């Protein structure tokens with residue numbers, strides 16, 4: 179199932195759904211629209227419904243009486259495979275067996291709701307390609323829908339748009355004959371696999387949804403104005419796409435690696451993890467760190483967690499191996515009395531060994547939002563391996579939520595960018611917070627977006643959710659909250675405007 183999340187259901191509607199359409203073991207997840215970052219896992223157990231709270235303030239999903247997760251899709255996958263592990267306050271096991279699917283099409287990229295045939299034709303003509311499609315409400319026939327699909331070659335009649343009426347009869351959907359579907363999703367998925375064929379032979383291939391999120395960067399202020407009503411719905415549509423990203427994380431799951439993870443279920447994807455070479459021959463598994471390469475698709479990044487006492491040496495092995503010259507830390511060492519990252523650097527003017535690596539803290543420079551530490555890193559016994567590593571430690575990020583103004587973050591990122599650009603052949607920029615997905619993902623996505631604008635100027639295309647999805651395919655849960663999502667838009671808006679004012 180990819181439809182266990184119900185975006186627009188109340189608690190009462192969720193109970194009644196589970197009691198009338200589910201059985202024991204049935205479950206769904208849903209947001210709170212009144213509360214930032216609050217979610218509920220509603221589960222049927224012994225003919226009654228229990229509601230389990232999941233909180234996210236920006237670092238991870240924290241399931242009450244369970245574990246911490248990078249995404250709700252990863253949470254659901256974990257518990258569907260690990261019975262006995264989800265427990266009530268009194269210790270009673272809550273079983274997740276039967277996802278209860280949602281018919282609401284608003285989480286789907288192809289759903290445009292209120293939209294005329296003329297508007298759909300103009301959007302498909304201007305932005306669409308062969309096989310671009312969308313579903314919209316009927317204006318002629320209230321309660322029905324229309325599927326609109328561009329087919330063609332790459333305006334000379336070589337391409338066209340076809341509209342296919344979708345009747346809704348007794349809460350089922352059909353295209354005039356054949357199967358009646360329980361939701362628009364089931365209908366679209368069926369006709370994605372078994373495309374409709376016209377009388378004269380055109381195959382109405384449903385290849386990709388119409389893109390609605392790519393904007394010109396100089397239009398950012400008007401997109402932000404529209405989304406400030408709109409952000410909630412755009413974020414939901416992005417979040418649905420996390421169900422495509424359940425990539426393997428087998429290395430992080432090995433016994434030998436379990437205690438190298440800050441959180442046991444927040445793990446790097448095997449396909450993009452940083453593999454550590456040249457390890458201690460006496461250490462059976464020496465290749466593992468909870469870190470992934472993030473390559474935008476000109477810098478690359480390593481996204482990683484805050485060090486644990488037993489991973490400081492591995493952190494420095496990573497930095498040295500990848501030739502990283504800039505570290506971005508976006509947590510204090512301690513927040514709300516809890517350790518978010520061990521101090522992995524020496525005191526100012528001090529020299530420390532961290533296994534085979536030696537680090538000197540040459541000088542610290544305090545700015546209003548950050549401290550810069552000029553570090554010198556070398557392998558013990560090999561003096562000519564010394565290189566400067568500049569650690570940019572952002573210190574004023576709030577304990578929960580996001581900054582109210584993106585100015586401090588943008589000034590910090592500009593400085594980080596310029597430092598990186600000044601070092602010939604520097605490796606990826608290391609970015610870390612606590613779990614290395616929320617703040618870390620936010621800083622990385624802002625940096626990627628501003629980088630496009632920095633090179634191409636104010637008149638270039640950007641697509642915030644497409645960029646986030648691309649980063650999320652390389653490390654689980656990059657960008658955690660709707661507040662961080664809005665902050666990314668705000669930061670990009672503020673960056674654009676500061677370029678425009680320089681020209682005045």
Ligand SMILES: Nc1ccnc2c1N=C(C(=O)Nc1cccnc1)C2
Pocket residue numbers: 180183209250251285410411413414417418419420421659660
């Ligand atoms: N539709 C989904 C399928 C899978 N996983 C999630 C989904 N939606 C999520 C989510 O966090 N939604 C959300 C919306 C608006 C604001 N904040 C969160 C998470």
